[PDB]
Design a protein around this ligand. Structure first.
Ligand SMILES: O=C(CN1Cc2ccc(Cl)cc2[C@H](C(=O)Nc2cncc3ccccc23)C1)Nc1ccc2scnc2c1
Ligand SMILES: O=C(CN1Cc2ccc(Cl)cc2[C@H](C(=O)Nc2cncc3ccccc23)C1)Nc1ccc2scnc2c1
Ligand SMILES: [Cl-]
Lengths: 305, 305
C-alpha cells in the first residue's frame, strides 16, 4: 500500500552527465557514445541572448573553445554541429557507461523523471508532467540548463526533455533531444510567457482509481454520465476534454476496481461542483493530475528496471 | 524557481541491490564490500511470524541455504550472523560498485530517499520522512522488504533505513542498518499499530520559509508569539511541540528572509485557525511537513524573491 510521486531510478542517466563550458557560460551536457548534447545557448553571452544569430556565433568557435568535464576528467572536443536548439559536441572518447537509449518526443499529459544537475553533477531526481501549455513545473536554479528528462522501459532509457529556460511565472521550458522546443518558446531573452494552463483529466481519473485501489472510496457515487455531458462540465472548470482514447486507456483500471470510466467521471463531476468538504484523497486536498494511467498501473504492480 | 519533493540521485544505491532467497521467501539485500544486509525475517515462513524464535531458526541454517543474486550472477555465501533484526551474509566477492558510505540512525522529522526494489531490481525512487510515531508513509508492495532509505551528502551515501513491514493502517516500519527498529515495533505478526501521528512543526515552518524565498507572503501577519503560547495552540491541532533546538535550527532561514522564528510561528497559528481560503502555498492546499530546514536550504535559492 501507499501512493507516492515516484521517479524512475536515475543511475543510468547519472553516468551520462557532464559539464560543458564555453567562455563564461557553464551548463550540463548529456554524454552518449562519442557525442555530448547540450543547449546551444552555451555559445551565447548575456548581450547575445536578445537577438542571437546562432549560426554566426557558432562559426566563430573552434573545438578547443568547448571545455567538457566528465567527473574529474577532461574530454577533448574533436567536432561540433547544431541540430535545432541543441549543440552536438563530438568528443574523442565514447562514454563507457552509455546505456541502451532512444530519443523520444512526449505529448502533454505524459510524465517523466528529471535529474536536476549543476556543473555536470546530479543533485536530485523528481517526477513531473509536460503540462497542456507545454511547460513543466520543475525545480531548477541557475546552472541547471542541460539537465534531462527521461522514462525507462525495460533496460532502455528514453530521453524526452532537455532543460533550457525558466519563464517569469517560475515554470520551465525546454526541448526534446533533437532540439525541438515543447511549446511556442524560443531560446532568446525576449518577452515570453506560459499560456493559460488546464488540468489533465485522464490523469485525475487515473489518480482517483489509484485512491480506490488504496482503500479511499468516499467520493464514489451511484451515478453515471455521458462523455458529452462530462466534457461540458470539464471545460467549465478548465479541464482538458476527455476523449474516447482516454476512456479506452482507463479500461484496465476500470476492470480492476469495477468502476466504469463514466461512473468515475460522475464522481469527478461532483468533486468539481461540491469540492472535498474537508476531506482528502491520497493525502491531498487538491485533485492530482501528474500520474498517468500507466504510472498508476506500474506503482500498483511493482515493475522493475 | 519551483519547489518539488526531491529525492537524491539513486545510482550509488542501485549498484548495491541484490536478491536474497531462503527457502520459499525472496526479498532484497544491500551488498556493501563483502557483506549482504537483509531483514532477518527472510529465514521465516508465514507460520513462524506469529512467535518466531530467530536464534532457533538461524542455527538450523547453513551458508548454502542462502541464495544471493547480483544481476544475473550468484554470489557464494561464506558466513552469516544476526545483528538485532538484520541478517548479515558474508559473500566471497566484494561489491566493486560499493560507494563511500556510512550507517546513520535518524530522528523523527528527518527526511530521506527510498529506492523501492523487487527481486533485487530497483523500480522507483521517492522522498519521505520518519514520522513522529516512527513509521513512514511509503509506497511498498509484497517483495519490497529489504529496500533501503538513504541520504547522499558530498558523494557519501548515509543508509538510514531498511524496510521490514506494513502496519494495518497502510504505513511502514523498519530498522536502521544495525537492525534496530524505529519505534516500538517487532518483526513479529502481532497486534501492533502505529501510534496517533502528529505534524512535524519545524518542517512546516521550514516550508513556510521556502514559500517566502520563492516570493509568496500572503500568510504572514503583524503578530508574534511566545514559544509556550505557540505550543499550547499547536498541540490542539495535533502538531509536535516546537523546542528551542528547532528555533535555533531555523536561524539561517529567519536571517535570509528577515522573518523571526516566533513571527513565522504566529503566521502558522493563524493558518491553523483560518485555513487557506482557496489559496495554495507552493502549489499545495495542505501544510507540508516532509521538508526539513536542511532540505529547504539545499533546494531553494540563496537569494530571496
Ligand atoms: O537571469 C536570467 C537570464 N536567463 C535568460 C535566458 C534566456 C533564454 C534561455 Cl533559453 C535561457 C536563459 C537563462 C535561463 O532561463 N536560465 C534558467 C533556467 N532554469 C532556471 C533558472 C533559475 C534561475 C535563473 C536562471 C534559470 C538565463 N533569467 C532568470 C530567470 C528566472 C529567474 S528566478 C531568479 N532569477 C531568475 C533569472
Ligand atoms: O501479508 C502480510 C504478512 N506480513 C506479516 C509481517 C510481519 C512482520 C514483518 Cl517484520 C513482516 C511481515 C510481512 C510484511 O509486512 N510484508 C510487507 C512489507 N511491506 C509492504 C507490504 C505490502 C503488502 C504485503 C506485504 C508487505 C508479511 N501483511 C500484509 C500487510 C499489508 C498488506 S496490504 C495488502 N496485503 C497486506 C498484507
Ligand atoms: Cl536525524
Amino acid at each position: 500500500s501507499g501512493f507516492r510521486k515516484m521517479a524512475f531510478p536515475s543511475g543510468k542517466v547519472e553516468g551520462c552527465m557532464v559539464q560543458v563550458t564555453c567562455g563564461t557560460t557553464t551548463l550540463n551536457g548529456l554524454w552518449l557514445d562519442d557525442v555530448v548534447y547540450c543547449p546551444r545557448h552555451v555559445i551565447c553571452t548575456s548581450e547575445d541572448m536578445l537577438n542571437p544569430n546562432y549560426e554566426d556565433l557558432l562559426i566563430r568557435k573552434s573545438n578547443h573553445n568547448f571545455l567538457v568535464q566528465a567527473g574529474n576528467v577532461q574530454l577533448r572536443v574533436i567536432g561540433h554541429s547544431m541540430q535545432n536548439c541543441v549543440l552536438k559536441l563530438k568528443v574523442d572518447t565514447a562514454n563507457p557507461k552509455t546505456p541502451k537509449y532512444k530519443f523520444v518526443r512526449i505529448q502533454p499529459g505524459q510524465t517523466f523523471s528529471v535529474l536536476a544537475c549543476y556543473n555536470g553533477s546530479p543533485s536530485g531526481v523528481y517526477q513531473c508532467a509536460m503540462r497542456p501549455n507545454f511547460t513543466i513545473k520543475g525545480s531548477f536554479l541557475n546552472g541547471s540548463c542541460g539537465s534531462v528528462g527521461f522514462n525507462i522501459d525495460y533496460d532502455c532509457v528514453s530521453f524526452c526533455y532537455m532543460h533550457h529556460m525558466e519563464l517569469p511565472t517560475g515554470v520551465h521550458a525546454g526541448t526534446d533531444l533533437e532540439g525541438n522546443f515543447y511549446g511556442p518558446f524560443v531560446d532568446r531573452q525576449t518577452a515570453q510567457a506560459a499560456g493559460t494552463d488546464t488540468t489533465i483529466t485522464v490523469n485525475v481519473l487515473a489518480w482517483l482509481y489509484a485512491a480506490v485501489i488504496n482503500g479511499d472510496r468516499w467520493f464514489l457515487n451511484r451515478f453515471t454520465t455521458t462523455l458529452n455531458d462530462f466534457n461540458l462540465v470539464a471545460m467549465k472548470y478548465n479541464y482538458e476534454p476527455l476523449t474516447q482514447d482516454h476512456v479506452d486507456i482507463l479500461g484496465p483500471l476500470s476492470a480492476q476496481t469495477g468502476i466504469a470510466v463514466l461512473d468515475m467521471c460522475a464522481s469527478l463531476k461532483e468533486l468539481l461542483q461540491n469540492g472535498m468538504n474537508g476531506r482528502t484523497i491520497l493525502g491531498s486536498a487538491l485533485l492530482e493530475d501528474e500520474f498517468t494511467p500507466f504510472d498508476v498501473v506500474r506503482q500498483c504492480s511493482g515493475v522493475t528496471f
